[PDB]
Amino acid sequence: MGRGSMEEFTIYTGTTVPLMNDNIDTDQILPKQFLKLIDKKGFGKYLMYEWRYLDNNYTENPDFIFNQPEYREASILITGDNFGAGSSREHAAWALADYGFKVIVAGSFGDIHYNNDLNNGILPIIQPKEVRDKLAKLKPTDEVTVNLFEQKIYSPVGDFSFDIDGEWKHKLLNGLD
Numbered sequence: 001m002g003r004g005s006m007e008e009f010t011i012y013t014g015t016t017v018p019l020m021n022d023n024i025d026t027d028q029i030l031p032k033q034f035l036k037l038i039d040k041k042g043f044g045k046y047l048m049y050e051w052r053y054l055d056n057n058y059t060e061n062p063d064f065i066f067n068q069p070e071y072r073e074a075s076i077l078i079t080g081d082n083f084g085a086g087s088s089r090e091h092a093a094w095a096l097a098d099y100g101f102k103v104i105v106a107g108s109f110g111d112i113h114y115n116n117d118l119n120n121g122i123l124p125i126i127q128p129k130e131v132r133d134k135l136a137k138l139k140p141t142d143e144v145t146v147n148l149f150e151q152k153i154y155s156p157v158g159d160f161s162f163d164i165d166g167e168w169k170h171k172l173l174n175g176l177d
Contacts, residue, residue: 001038001094006177007121013073013145016155017066018136024079025086026113032087042052043091044098068139075105078135081082083124084113093120105132105153107126118168119177123148136156148172155164 010062034046036162038150045058052064060067068072077096083106084092093116096104104117105125115125134157138144145154153160170176 001043001097001120003121004090004119004177005121006119006171006175009102009111009121009123009148009172011145011149012123013076013143014102015071015073015140015142016076016078016135016138016144017065017071017074017140018078018138020078020080020132020136022080022107023082023085025088026089026092026110031083034095035091036088036090039091039094042098043095044100047095047099059109060096068140073100074140075100076144076146077101077105078138079104079106080108080132081107083107083109084117085110088112090116090120093117093122097121100120105130105135118172123172125153125162125164127153127162131158153175166169 030043030046031049044059052061052066053059054061065071071077091112097120101122103123103125107129108126109124138155138157142156150160151164
């Protein structure tokens with residue numbers, strides 16, 4: 001990833017993966033050594049690097065949830081509080097986008113990271129902990145629809161409203177950067 005280009009977001013459907021830790025900081029999302037790479041590179045393979053691999057040869061950690069067979073095409077991330085705080089790192093959004101995340105549902109986000117996600121084809125969502133724990137118990141095959149016109153999430157575990165600033169809404173719904 002690289003663009004910083006506004007991609008259209010209206011209604012999106014995908015399956016989910018839960019990783020419910022608080023304070024997944026930009027360093028955990030995309031380690032500092034990878035900031036040496038130019039923005040034409042793919043960052044997907046570096047996403048969550050230290051959780052995801054056992055060594056420096058890309059041997060997958062078979063315990064990391066993203067690697068689990070049922071979750072390898074998940075496009076909607078359910079997490080904890082304060083996702084993406086710490087050193088400002090637009091590359092961390094590129095990693096998430098390049099991997100294939102379109103939506104993230106958290107307790108809260110780092111301020112810059114929130115903007116970086118929105119500027120790189122991800123919709124970051126704030127939900128209360130009660131809903132995020134419901135979403136975390138979805139089946140890997142369960143579809144979830146996010147409808148930005150309605151500001152609603154639909155799932156087998158419930159349907160939920162969310163807030164978003166009207167200006168972000170206008171930019172996402174239209175093709176607009």
